[PDB]
Enzyme design. Structure first.
Site, PDB file in Angstrom:
ATOM      1  CE1 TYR A 130      14.561 -28.693 -13.850  1.00 24.73           C
ATOM      2  CE2 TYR A 130      16.898 -28.883 -14.373  1.00 24.73           C
ATOM      3  CZ  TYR A 130      15.645 -28.368 -14.651  1.00 24.73           C
ATOM      4  OH  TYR A 130      15.480 -27.527 -15.731  1.00 24.73           O
ATOM      5  CG  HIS A 178      15.168 -32.078 -18.069  1.00 24.35           C
ATOM      6  ND1 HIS A 178      15.586 -33.184 -17.361  1.00 24.35           N
ATOM      7  CD2 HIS A 178      15.043 -32.478 -19.356  1.00 24.35           C
ATOM      8  CE1 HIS A 178      15.703 -34.211 -18.184  1.00 24.35           C
ATOM      9  NE2 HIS A 178      15.379 -33.811 -19.400  1.00 24.35           N
ATOM     10  CG  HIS A 182       5.403 -21.752 -15.381  1.00 25.82           C
ATOM     11  ND1 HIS A 182       5.820 -21.343 -14.132  1.00 25.82           N
ATOM     12  CD2 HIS A 182       4.409 -20.905 -15.740  1.00 25.82           C
ATOM     13  CE1 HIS A 182       5.106 -20.300 -13.750  1.00 25.82           C
ATOM     14  NE2 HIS A 182       4.242 -20.013 -14.708  1.00 25.82           N
ATOM     15  CE1 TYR A 190      11.627 -25.383 -11.028  1.00 28.92           C
ATOM     16  CE2 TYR A 190      11.890 -27.768 -11.140  1.00 28.92           C
ATOM     17  CZ  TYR A 190      11.583 -26.564 -11.749  1.00 28.92           C
ATOM     18  OH  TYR A 190      11.229 -26.539 -13.079  1.00 28.92           O
ATOM     19  CE1 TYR A 220       9.005 -24.820 -15.201  1.00 31.23           C
ATOM     20  CE2 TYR A 220       9.494 -23.552 -17.188  1.00 31.23           C
ATOM     21  CZ  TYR A 220       9.191 -24.759 -16.579  1.00 31.23           C
ATOM     22  OH  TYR A 220       9.073 -25.896 -17.349  1.00 31.23           O
TER      23      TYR A 220
HETATM   24  N1  LIG Z   1       3.085 -23.180 -19.139  1.00 34.16           N
HETATM   25  C1  LIG Z   1       3.769 -23.379 -20.272  1.00 34.16           C
HETATM   26  N2  LIG Z   1       3.266 -22.976 -21.490  1.00 34.16           N
HETATM   27  C2  LIG Z   1       3.918 -23.158 -22.675  1.00 34.16           C
HETATM   28  N3  LIG Z   1       5.151 -23.761 -22.749  1.00 34.16           N
HETATM   29  C3  LIG Z   1       5.664 -24.158 -21.544  1.00 34.16           C
HETATM   30  C4  LIG Z   1       5.066 -24.009 -20.316  1.00 34.16           C
HETATM   31  N4  LIG Z   1       5.896 -24.540 -19.291  1.00 34.16           N
HETATM   32  C5  LIG Z   1       6.933 -24.977 -19.935  1.00 34.16           C
HETATM   33  N5  LIG Z   1       6.910 -24.804 -21.309  1.00 34.16           N
HETATM   34  C6  LIG Z   1       7.743 -25.115 -22.311  1.00 34.16           C
HETATM   35  O1  LIG Z   1       8.815 -26.013 -21.839  1.00 34.16           O
HETATM   36  C7  LIG Z   1      10.117 -25.437 -21.742  1.00 34.16           C
HETATM   37  C8  LIG Z   1      10.724 -25.747 -20.317  1.00 34.16           C
HETATM   38  S1  LIG Z   1      11.323 -27.382 -20.203  1.00 34.16           S
HETATM   39  C9  LIG Z   1       9.821 -28.372 -19.810  1.00 34.16           C
HETATM   40  C10 LIG Z   1       9.950 -29.443 -20.864  1.00 34.16           C
HETATM   41  C11 LIG Z   1       9.474 -29.150 -22.251  1.00 34.16           C
HETATM   42  N6  LIG Z   1       7.988 -28.852 -22.467  1.00 34.16           N
HETATM   43  C12 LIG Z   1       9.847 -30.332 -23.223  1.00 34.16           C
HETATM   44  O2  LIG Z   1       9.000 -30.821 -23.992  1.00 34.16           O
HETATM   45  O3  LIG Z   1      11.078 -30.704 -23.149  1.00 34.16           O
HETATM   46  C13 LIG Z   1       9.932 -23.994 -22.053  1.00 34.16           C
HETATM   47  O4  LIG Z   1      11.089 -23.506 -22.723  1.00 34.16           O
HETATM   48  C14 LIG Z   1       8.607 -23.987 -22.905  1.00 34.16           C
HETATM   49  O5  LIG Z   1       8.888 -24.183 -24.288  1.00 34.16           O
END
Ligand SMILES: Nc1ncnc2c1ncn2[C@@H]1O[C@H](CSCC[C@H](N)C(=O)O)[C@@H](O)[C@H]1O
Lengths: 239, 5
Positions: A130, A178, A182, A190, A220
């Site tokens: 990361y 990144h 979550h 992490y 997260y």
């Molecule tokens: N459990 C979850 N449910 C819905 N959206 C999630 C999630 N965990 C992560 N995300 C989504 O992912 C973002 C973190 S970055 C993880 C990468 C992202 N999904 C991408 O396609 O680049 C968040 O802002 C949210 O939009």
């Protein structure tokens, strides 16, 4: 004389013969990743990578490592980010990470893209890195959540971020940490990591066994985005 | 507070 191995808490290590000053300087120094197989062999000055080439640690004889260079001309060097620069070569992937994870559509409904494993591994395995630009907590906590989707606290003084347009793989793939989504039942965490190219950052380490093509998730640990609050309520229920 | 921990 003799050979010296310095192992970091994360599992990675530096190996080589120290100069008259007792510093890891020379053209045959190497950083070896946590798998004790993948390495960056080449020029280092006082442990800092100047020009490392991808190599494989074949074996070690009484502390002496034997490396075999991987075909290619891709060289790596210390390239710690700043508040405005994420990487000198945003499109040059990390070799160790490239062999362990890939990005694809997430299995989590409406989550967007996700990070997946390429191989079956056991617990405590470092899978991804990361890296990102380095900014303050004040800057992050003072702006809208819409801009903090990729912010990750490194310590009490630094926040790592992957801001637009670097959140797109076509624009940045030097590291992919990144991209892990979550989960309240995560298979990864992490963890601190000292990287030869990225410097002090965090990595994604498995908490247990993970299979090939299994999506990697982390808690997260979040006040948080709407999607998070919704998931939290959905979790507290049916749990 | 607005970052992963
Ligand atoms: N459990 C979850 N449910 C819905 N959206 C999630 C999630 N965990 C992560 N995300 C989504 O992912 C973002 C973190 S970055 C993880 C990468 C992202 N999904 C991408 O396609 O680049 C968040 O802002 C949210 O939009």
């Amino acid at each position: 004389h003799g050979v010296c191995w310095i192992y970091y808490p994360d599992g990675g290590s530096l190996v080589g013969e120290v100069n008259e000053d007792g510093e890891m300087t020379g053209e045959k120094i190497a950083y070896v990743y946590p798998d004790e197989r993948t390495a960056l062999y080449g020029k280092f000055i006082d442990g800092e990578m100047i020009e490392g080439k991808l190599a494989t640690l074949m074996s070690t004889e009484e502390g002496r490592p034997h490396f075999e260079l991987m075909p290619g001309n891709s060289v790596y060097h210390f390239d710690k980010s700043t508040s405005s620069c994420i990487s000198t070569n945003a499109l040059l992937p990390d070799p160790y990470e490239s062999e362990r994870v890939y990005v694809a559509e997430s299995l989590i409904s409406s989550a967007g893209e996700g990070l997946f494993s390429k191989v079956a591994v056991g617990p405590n395995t470092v899978m991804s890195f990361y890296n990102g630009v380095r900014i303050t907590h004040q800057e992050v906590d003072s702006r809208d959540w819409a801009l903090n989707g990729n912010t990750l606290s490194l310590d009490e003084e630094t926040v790592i971020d992957v801001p637009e347009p670097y959140n797109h793989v076509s624009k940045y793939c030097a590291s992919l940490g990144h991209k892990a989504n979550h989960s309240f039942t995560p298979n990864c965490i992490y963890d601190m990591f000292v990287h030869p190219r990225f410097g002090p950052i965090k990595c994604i380490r498995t908490l247990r066994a993970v299979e090939a093509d299994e999506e990697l998730t982390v808690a997260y640990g979040y006040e948080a985005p709407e999607w998070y609050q919704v998931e939290l309520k959905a979790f507290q229920a049916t749990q | 507070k607005r970052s992963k921990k």
